[PDB]
């Protein structure tokens, strides 16, 4: 029940995978993709004290993480070492998988004692914290990150222009703080119009003998920055929709049963899959929208 | 090769994806479900001193893991705490994503001393221990269980009452113990005429900002109820049938390698996709049933 | 929670004008957000128009744009949409949904809804 949106001349228009998509073309999995939009561009305040308000703990609710394919750069993003005061540890230590949020502009470290009353720190508001294409529902320990919200959509079949190279290294600060007692249209406080983004290239990243992984770049080289600023219909209307799919999204992994899920997408493929040549469809029938000749 | 079960006109039929299966409308993945039934239906005894003989002791084979999406309420569990004779633990911790059996109306807490010849600790009669949306072959160290099989089904198409809220509360009691020296025709000694289920949540259950997990229900507010006595011939089929898909479930759980196994209805229907639309099939083939008129 | 209850439909001529209303019930209504969806006969519902919990953001569709205006008062627990300028594809069925604070364009996220009014203009 996850809202997927269709781009097509640039516009972006919102339909369930069920609406009768056969004039909208999907020939590959390439065409699926999940963009993790954060909440700094919606013109939340980002500074720390008013940053903190927005997360609580809580105790009895599993974490769940969800994969995310391309990201956005952040201004601001968070780096907690909350302790008890008796110094016991409150955050829990982040798992193998997480690594911390790439291409952040400035880091605001907050370290400090104060009264930790769950076992694990949610978002109040209902977003995701993002680590580095993986999106969880709590605040791991050390690990850098930045809130913000994720959307799924199908591209359009080109050459990729939607996240290629550069279309139209980088240096991140340290701020140290001490703390105590711790047709979609757009309507959002704010919306940026340009959206600074990075993502991994699957191939295409191999000269010399450089696909090696003892002759290979580190975990920082392999991204793939750009920019997308010509229109700015579209990245509201695509703002707007990432806030929106937020609740059927958090259903889903309350649901679920699996610690991290990678396969949303290939659902919805199987779904399309079943929906449309399912069985005994029609010529002249509107469901099995085929042409004759 | 795992058996599977079609109903239709609340009848039981067993077939596979290779059969053809043409008025079987099969056209979304919401219809493939799994359900675990309680081997205490079936008329096993189900005190402590019977219940512990059906539990063995073995070391070199792997545990393995696979899910069930809807199962039963049990009026009998166990949680086992069992030692060695010097002190040390026979059962392993559970992990992480493993939690007790809800809906339980008895708790029976066995511990005690008693040889643990092997590592592990199995089910002699080839059955499952169920932990929350989760059989395993294993028993964990103190975590409720009950002792049931696992069923696919095929649900009849956009019906929306089978696992539904109460067509046509909850209170556990604990009671402790001591231990020393530890188409289808039902065929069971009996089979209960009565199937009082639950079942995940059907996505959506949030209205006042309900859906974040901050302000959420806890991990046993989730689950919704029902109770479906009125047929008493397709119940006990889908108990024989139950029966029936344990060896070929244990088989392909030996073969495979990963230690949790989510993706067999997934398989289940690109087998069928690839089968019945697989390539260079006629109009008047009957490989493709696909009707011209 | 919260019950609504729309009015004011009926039949008016092509370019007349049309006000609606919503009344809810309950006494935390300053706290709930209010928009408009339309449905066409034979076609799916949508999204016309939105305010706040608080009146300071209202959204509009591409289609109604300039023509529709929405606007609520505390005091009285109502909501109006004013209409002007009509034209035969804006006959529809107006439904009135509630949600908590803020604005939204998907219709699940909504949590209550009234049984709509009808507005039929002739050519």
């Known amino acids: 029940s996850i809202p997927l949106g269709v781009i097509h001349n640039s516009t972006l228009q919102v339909s369930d995978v069920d609406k009768l998509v056969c004039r909208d073309k999907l020939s590959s999995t390439n065409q699926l993709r999940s963009v993790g939009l954060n909440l700094e561009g919606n013109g939340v305040a980002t500074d720390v004290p008013s940053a903190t308000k927005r997360w609580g703990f809580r105790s009895g609710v599993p974490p769940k993480v969800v994969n995310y394919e391309a990201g956005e750069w952040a201004e601001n993003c968070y780096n907690l070492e909350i302790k008890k005061p008796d110094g016991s540890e409150c955050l829990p230590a982040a798992p193998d998988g997480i690594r911390g949020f790439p291409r952040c502009r400035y880091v605001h470290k907050v370290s400090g004692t104060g009264p930790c009353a769950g076992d694990f720190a949610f978002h109040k508001e209902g977003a995701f914290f993002l680590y580095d294409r993986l999106a969880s529902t709590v605040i791991y320990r050390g690990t850098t990150f930045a809130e913000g919200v994720v959307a799924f959509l199908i591209l359009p079949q080109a050459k990729k222009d939607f996240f290629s190279s550069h279309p139209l290294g980088y240096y991140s600060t340290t701020i140290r703080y001490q703390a105590t007692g711790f047709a979609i249209v757009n309507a959002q406080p704010k919306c940026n119009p340009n959206l600074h983004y990075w993502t991994t290239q699957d191939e295409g990243a191999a000269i010399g003998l450089a696909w090696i992984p003892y002759f290979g770049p580190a975990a920082e080289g392999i991204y793939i920055e750009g920019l997308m600023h010509n229109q700015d219909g579209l990245i509201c209307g695509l703002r707007q929709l990432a806030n929106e799919t937020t609740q059927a999204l958090q259903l889903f992994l309350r649901a679920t049963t699996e610690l991290r899920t990678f396969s949303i997408l290939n659902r919805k493929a199987i779904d399309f899959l079943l929906q449309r040549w399912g069985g005994t469809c029609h010529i002249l029938g509107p469901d099995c929208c085929i042409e004759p000749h | 090769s795992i058996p599977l079960g079609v109903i239709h006109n609340s009848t039981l039929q067993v077939s596979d994806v290779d059969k053809l299966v043409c008025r079987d409308k099969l056209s979304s993945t919401n219809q493939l479900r799994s359900v675990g039934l309680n081997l205490e239906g079936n008329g096993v005894a189900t005190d402590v001193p019977s219940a512990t003989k059906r539990w063995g002791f073995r070391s070199g084979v792997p545990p393995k893991v696979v899910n069930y999406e809807a199962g039963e309420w049990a009026e009998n569990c166990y949680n086992l705490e069992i030692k060695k004779p010097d002190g040390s633990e026979c059962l392993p911790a559970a992990p992480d994503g493993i939690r007790g059996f809800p809906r339980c109306r008895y708790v029976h807490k066995v511990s005690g001393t008693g040889p643990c010849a092997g590592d592990f600790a199995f089910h002699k009669e080839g059955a499952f221990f169920l932990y929350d949306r989760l059989a395993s072959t294993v028993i964990y160290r103190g975590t409720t269980f009950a002792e049931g099989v696992v069923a696919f089904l095929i649900l009849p198409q956009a019906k929306k009452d089978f696992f539904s809220s109460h067509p046509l509360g909850y209170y556990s009691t604990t009671i402790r113990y001591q231990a020393t020296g530890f188409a289808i025709v039902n065929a069971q000694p009996k089979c209960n005429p009565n199937l009082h289920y639950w079942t995940t949540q059907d996505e959506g259950a949030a209205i006042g900002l309900a859906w974040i997990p901050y302000f959420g229900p806890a991990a046993e507010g989730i689950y919704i109820e029902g109770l479906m006595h009125n047929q008493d011939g397709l119940i006990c089929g889908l108990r024989q049938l139950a029966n029936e898909t344990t060896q070929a479930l244990q088989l392909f759980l030996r073969a495979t390698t990963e230690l949790r196994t989510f993706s067999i209805l997934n398989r289940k229907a690109i087998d069928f996709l690839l089968q019945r639309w697989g390539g260079t099939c006629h109009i008047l083939g009957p490989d493709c049933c696909i009707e011209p008129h | 929670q919260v019950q609504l209850q729309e009015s004011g439909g009926g039949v008016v001529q092509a370019g007349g004008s049309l006000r609606l209303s919503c009344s809810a019930s309950?006494?935390?209504?300053?706290?709930?957000?209010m928009a408009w969806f339309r449905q066409a006969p034979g076609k799916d519902r949508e999204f016309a128009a939105g305010?706040?919990?608080?009146?300071?953001?209202?959204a509009y569709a591409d289609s109604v744009k300039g023509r529709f205006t929405i606007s609520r008062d505390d005091a009285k627990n109502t909501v109006y949409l004013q209409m002007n300028s009509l034209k035969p594809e804006d006959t529809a069925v107006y439904s009135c949904?509630?949600?908590?604070?803020?604005?939204?364009?998907?219709?699940?996220?909504?949590?209550?809804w009234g049984q709509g009014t009808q507005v039929t203009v002739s050519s």
């Open positions: 305010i706040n919990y608080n009146g300071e953001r209202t």
């Open positions: 309950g006494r935390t209504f300053s706290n709930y957000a």
């Open positions: 949904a509630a949600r908590p604070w803020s604005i939204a364009n998907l219709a699940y996220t909504y949590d209550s």
